[PDB]
Design a binder for these strands. Structure first.
Lengths: 21, 30, 125, 118, 163, 218, 168, 106
RNA sequence: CUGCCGAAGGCAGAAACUCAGAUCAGUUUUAUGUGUAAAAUGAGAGUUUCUAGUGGGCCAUUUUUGGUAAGCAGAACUGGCGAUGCGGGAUGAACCGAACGUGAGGUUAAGGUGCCGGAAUGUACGCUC
């Protein structure tokens, strides 16, 4: 398996959520 | 001066025996 | 001669790349660090520990947390510059600085001059 | 080119400085646990092949000419074409008559002699 | 009779220190005139063709290697008014010893400045001094500074002092 | 004789601008590749979206532990990687199979992605080609053209491109290259050399920080 | 030293999860590599997301918006001790969040013999309100008329000719 | 009485050594007035000389000199490493050396 | 005397000849369940033949059962020792580095920088009488 290629990761659908341990 | 009754420095058998029997203690508690 | 760590005390930096510069404490950050400023442009606003500075005897009225603009304004109003120089301590420091900047020909100038100073050694009988 | 010696101190047999029945000539230690053979610190070094000198200068005297043993005038004449690289050394058993005869022959040859003044 | 290989080492002119410009006062760090202060007339291929005013400190026309010279910040002395092209390596050439069979107190009596030293060399030195003295007389303290000698003392750190 | 000399000089010249044009093309390609990554990141930041760079296909591995007290499994793996000394460095085509292989010799080697300067610096200075099973320095392009001429590699710049960009002939280019014999790092390692790089040590993956080590190594 | 990083990541999309959720954490680490590993183990222990099936989508160092204003930072952390569990909350007055975290690490290593791996940081928040401050020494610093002489004055050049001043 | 000393003072401290191994090929020299490696940068390449006296008169003088050159700094406190034409004797530990001002670089 | 090769708890070497191979690997991926099968990297791979020495033991490692105030005993693998000098742990058969031709220069590992001892009585924050 080759290394993962550059792509896009749209976040307007799932905005990042803050995680705390 | 040491100012002690028991020497703070240890013999090589004694220091080696700790790692001998400390490991066995972990074996026993396991 | 007390030199309490006040808000607005002017200080002389003695360790770091800003050695020999004059600053003023704006805020006391904690037990062991403080915020200082200075009207001089070459010295930027920064937080410095007390081990890298010696406190002076000059205290200048200054509201806490003031920006560099009015720190220069109040510094010029109370004339802190050349008030520090008026003290003999600054005269000794600048005399040392000029003596360090001195050169071999001018060292020979000092040679002759202090020989002319020892010229007299005249004491009244 | 010049002369470079890797080592000048000669290898002495171990304990030859303690016993006289033990000669100064090098003998390789054979004991399995001997300090000399196991090469501990502060011990006399052992003859290694790495101690050899440059081939272009090996066997050459300090002046660069290899010494060639000579007994008679014939041996002197053999150094005619090698006078720039070999030097005649007189054999120790050559009598006085042949020594002076040989040394003038070498001096006429222009061949250096390493024991001429004897 | 082997022929050595052609070495690819060519000779290029020396890049002297920029501080050793002609007309600069410098200290001799070695030689018979160690510690003396001199005025650099010009720069030769390797050394400095230099002299202290002989009527001041008595330092004749001499070459000194640039690595044995302390350049000063003392004000420049004009040297543009005197020619320097007569000072060449051949001019300074010490002829040739031609055998060490000498020094029986005769080579040393026949030496010194009375003999050997031509009256011509005295003429250039006096001419250079005649063209140099008016400048150092005009600017104060050069005559006394050049007559004095350099020496270290207690509390003197050469890596801190700047000349 | 004059015709042969002129024919030799001409063809050798025609090879020279060929090398020059190729090197110029590769240099332009590198700059266009870095420009596009910056533009991709900037536009993603402007839109609020995120952009994931390509994961580099090239890895540089340096062995940092001696030949003593190594388990046979790690010994065999580093034998496969041709890391038979400390400080020895190799370019490896990082892929799926290499990752798990390096996970075993992780305590014994450190690896990260080299930049253009590192791969250029290494080949110019530490670059020794493997010709006829002999270690021959890359002192001229004659060695490269005579040893890798069947893979269209004709100069040092061509070799640098095939290594840095992981070309189709990367295996042949890397196998032609003797392992780099780097010196002990100037300034030294960290306090402990045999912890994980993530724990304040030096072993294991270090990503873009292998360049800083290599500068000290060289 | 330390730098504060934000790490945003997700698992690799599949047919089961075409649009995986995006997980962002604010965490402190000397460099990006330590931050990514610090994040990955945190993600493993909170949400059971494996490192192999995930990927770091965004890495961004963060600088202090107002490094020239003295602030008070309260830090909620969890400690692994003999019992393996403890909760602490400290307050540090400093002009930067990074420096406050560095001071916290130094204090905990000095007091509870705590290491970087033993300490996990839950939250570093700013306390602007004076009343919300709980620590007396922080309140001592926050008093308006703070004043005190220099503590620990402590003062090659061996063989000084005169006695030290160590005063004014 | 004071018109001389175109040199700076120094002490021969010890051989460049490990705990149990000494390397007499290079020596450690402590220059008076030099207290940092950046200050030792000035003295790098200078000519250090060891001056001693002997009983037998050679060339009509009692004084013998061993030449040397400062090569690199040693440590943080200003000590340097010196290499001599003849390695200094181990009985000169703590003896006085004279570091001259040539070859000058300023 | 020197040099080279070099173990063993069926080996190492010698000679006689295959194929410029998909031929092997104290290895990792892929597929099927540590076994097997068919990509990565490294290496020139091999087959029959005969002929020296050895077949011991100590130390630690992870997998279990029998156990007791308390240690302990019996297995399997793994290495180190043994054939191995060197740096460090004040010194040392088993601890941390590092595998050794003769030298010059540079840089490190482990461990260290008050003096003995080469190297900061360095910087920064706390704790302790």
């Amino acid at each position: 398996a080759p290394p993962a290629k550059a792509h896009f990761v749209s976040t307007e659908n799932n905005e990042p959520v803050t995680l705390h341990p | 001066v040491s100012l002690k009754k028991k020497s703070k420095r240890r013999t090589t058998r004694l220091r080696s025996r700790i790692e001998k029997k400390a490991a066995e203690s972990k074996r026993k508690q396991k | 001669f007390k030199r309490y760590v006040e808000v607005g005390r002017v200080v002389l930096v003695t360790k770091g790349e800003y050695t020999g510069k004059l600053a003023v404490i704006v805020d006391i950050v904690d037990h062991k660090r403080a915020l200082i400023d200075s009207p001089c442009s070459e010295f930027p606003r920064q937080v410095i520990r007390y081990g890298s500075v010696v406190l002076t005897h000059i205290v200048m009225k200054l509201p806490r947390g003031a920006r560099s603009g009015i720190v220069a304004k109040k510094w010029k109003a109370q004339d802190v510059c050349n008030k520090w120089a008026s003290s003999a301590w600054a005269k000794k420091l600048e005399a040392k600085k000029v003596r360090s900047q001195l050169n071999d020909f001018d060292r020979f100038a000092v040679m002759r001059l202090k020989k002319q100073r020892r010229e007299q050694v005249n004491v009244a009988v | 080119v010049n002369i470079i010696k890797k080592r000048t101190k000669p290898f002495k047999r171990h304990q030859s400085d303690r016993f006289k029945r033990v000669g100064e000539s090098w003998r390789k230690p054979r004991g399995i646990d001997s300090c000399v053979r196991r090469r501990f610190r502060g011990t006399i070094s052992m003859p290694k092949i790495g101690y050899g000198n440059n081939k272009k200068t090996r066997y050459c005297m300090p002046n660069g000419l290899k010494a060639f043993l000579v007994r008679n005038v014939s041996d002197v004449e053999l150094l005619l074409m090698h006078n720039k690289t070999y030097a005649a050394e007189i054999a120790g058993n050559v009598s006085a008559r042949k020594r002076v005869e040989i040394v003038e022959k070498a001096r006429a040859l222009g061949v250096k002699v390493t024991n001429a003044g004897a | 009779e082997n022929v050595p290989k052609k070495a690819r080492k060519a000779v290029r002119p020396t890049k002297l220190r920029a501080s050793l410009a002609p007309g600069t006062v410098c200290i001799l760090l070695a030689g018979r005139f160690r510690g003396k202060r001199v005025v650099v007339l010009s720069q030769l291929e390797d050394t400095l063709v230099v002299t202290g005013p002989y009527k001041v400190n008595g330092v004749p026309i001499r070459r000194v290697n640039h690595r044995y010279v302390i350049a000063t910040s003392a004000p420049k002395i004009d040297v543009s008014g005197v020619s320097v092209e007569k000072f060449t390596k051949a001019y300074f050439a010490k002829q040739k010893r031609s055998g060490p069979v000498k020094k029986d107190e005769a080579f040393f009596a026949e030496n010194a400045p009375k003999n050997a030293l031509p009256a011509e060399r005295i003429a250039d030195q006096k001419a250079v001094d005649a063209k140099l003295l008016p400048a150092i007389k005009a600017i104060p303290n050069m005559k006394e500074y050049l007559a004095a000698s350099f020496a270290l003392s207690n509390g003197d750190r050469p890596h801190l002092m700047k000349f | 004789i004059v015709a042969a000399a002129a024919e030799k000089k001409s063809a050798r010249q025609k090879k020279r601008e060929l090398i020059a044009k190729r090197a110029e093309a590769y240099e332009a390609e590198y700059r266009a590749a870095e420009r596009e990554q910056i533009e991709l990141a900037r536009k993603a930041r402007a839109e609020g979206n995120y952009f994931v760079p390509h994961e580099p296909k090239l890895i540089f591995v340096v062995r940092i532990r001696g030949i003593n007290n190594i388990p046979p499994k790690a010994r065999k793996i580093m034998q496969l990687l041709r890391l038979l000394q400390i400080n020895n460095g190799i370019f490896v085509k990082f892929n799926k199979a290499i990752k798990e292989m390096l996970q075993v010799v992780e305590p014994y080697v450190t690896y990260g992605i080299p930049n253009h300067k590192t791969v250029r610096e290494l080949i110019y200075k530490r670059g020794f080609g493997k010709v006829n099973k002999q270690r021959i320095p890359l002192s001229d392009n004659a060695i490269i053209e005579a040893a890798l001429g069947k893979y269209s590699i004709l100069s040092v710049e061509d070799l640098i491109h095939e290594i840095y960009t992981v070309g189709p002939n990367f295996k042949q280019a890397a196998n032609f290259l003797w392992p780099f014999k780097l010196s002990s790092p100037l300034g030294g390692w960290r306090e402990r050399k045999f912890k994980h790089f993530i724990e304040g040590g030096d072993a294991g993956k270090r990503d873009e920080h292998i360049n800083g080590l290599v500068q000290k190594m060289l | 030293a330390l730098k504060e990083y934000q790490v945003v990541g997700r698992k690799v999309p599949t047919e089961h999860e075409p649009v995986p959720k995006l997980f962002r954490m604010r965490l402190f680490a000397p460099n990006e590599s330590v931050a990514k590993s610090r994040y990955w183990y945190f993600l493993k222990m909170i949400n059971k997301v494996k490192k192999a099936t995930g990927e770091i989508v965004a890495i961004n160092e963060i600088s202090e918006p107002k490094p020239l204003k003295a602030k008070v930072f309260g830090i909620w952390i969890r400690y692994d001790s003999r019992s393996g569990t403890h909760n602490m909350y400290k307050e540090f007055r400093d002009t930067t969040r990074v420096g406050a975290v560095e001071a916290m690490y130094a204090d905990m290593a000095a007091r509870h013999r705590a290491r970087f791996r033993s300490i996990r940081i839950l939250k570093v928040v700013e306390v602007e309100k004076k009343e919300d401050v709980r620590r007396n020494y922080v309140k001592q610093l926050l008093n308006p008329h703070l004043k005190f002489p220099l503590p620990h004055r402590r003062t090659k050049k061996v063989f000084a000719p005169h006695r030290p001043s160590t005063f004014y | 009485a004071q018109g001389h000393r175109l040199y700076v003072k120094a002490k021969h401290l010890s051989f460049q050594r490990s705990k149990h191994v000494i390397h007499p090929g290079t020596s450690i020299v402590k220059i008076e007035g030099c207290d940092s490696k950046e200050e030792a940068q000035f003295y790098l390449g200078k000519r250090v000389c060891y001056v001693y006296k002997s009983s037998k008169a050679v060339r009509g003088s009692k004084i013998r000199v061993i030449w040397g050159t400062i090569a690199r700094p040693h440590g943080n406190s200003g000590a340097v490493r010196a290499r001599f034409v003849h390695n200094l004797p181990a009985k000169t530990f703590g003896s006085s050396l004279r570091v001259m001002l040539y070859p000058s670089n300023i």
